[PDB]
Amino acid sequence: ELKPSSAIQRGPLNKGGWDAPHALHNDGAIDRYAHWRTFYQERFKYTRATGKSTLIFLVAFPALIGYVAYQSEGLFEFAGKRRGESVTTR
Amino acid sequence: GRYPFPKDVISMTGGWWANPSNWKLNGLFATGIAVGLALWVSTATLPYTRRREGITSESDISKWNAAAGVWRERHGKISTGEA
């Protein structure tokens, strides 16, 4: 019984416009290559190699830079020195 | 070689073999610009040029060293080699 009103007269949608002629013969292999690439994360998993990469660049590499930056914080003062002057502040 | 080339595209460099017919004529313009550029620039750059050695007196620079000494003694500064 319950259908919407007859006074719709709905029509099919167009995209609007002109059929540009296809200037590209798409390669299904290249297309499935790139579609495999852009949704890599939907099939990503954890392995030993994943763990090696995220060991280095997520923890180890910032800890290396943190050993650099805080230990060498305000040491060097290279403004204008002399032959014999100390180069650091500590 | 002289292989056939599609003459439709217009490049800023002219393209493949640009040999336009009035090259004897248009070269009268651009060189007329070119010479007309250079002497117009060379005069304009002329007051901005100068002779390097001998622009001021040694007496001026020696008095500037004197002013350096007057400044530096007031700040009380050791030499570069004093320890």
- d(CA B83, CA B81) in angstroms, rounded, equals 6
Chain B residue with minimal CA distance to A82? B80
Q: Would you say A65 and A56 are in contact if contact means Cβ atoms under 8 Å apart?
A: no
**Which method was used?**
cryo-EM
**Angstrom distance (rounded) from CA A38 to CA A42:** 9
Domain boundaries, chain A: 1-90
Q: How far is CA A24 from CA A16, A33, A43, A67, A81, in A?
A: 21, 17, 29, 53, 65
Residues 6+ apart with CB under 8 A from B80: A82, A83, A84
CB-based contact A83 B83, cutoff 8 Å:
no
Q: Report CB contact under 8 Å: A83, B80.
A: yes
Q: Looking at the complex, does the CB of residue B83 fall below 8 Å from at least one CB of chain A?
A: yes
Domain boundaries, chain B: 1-83
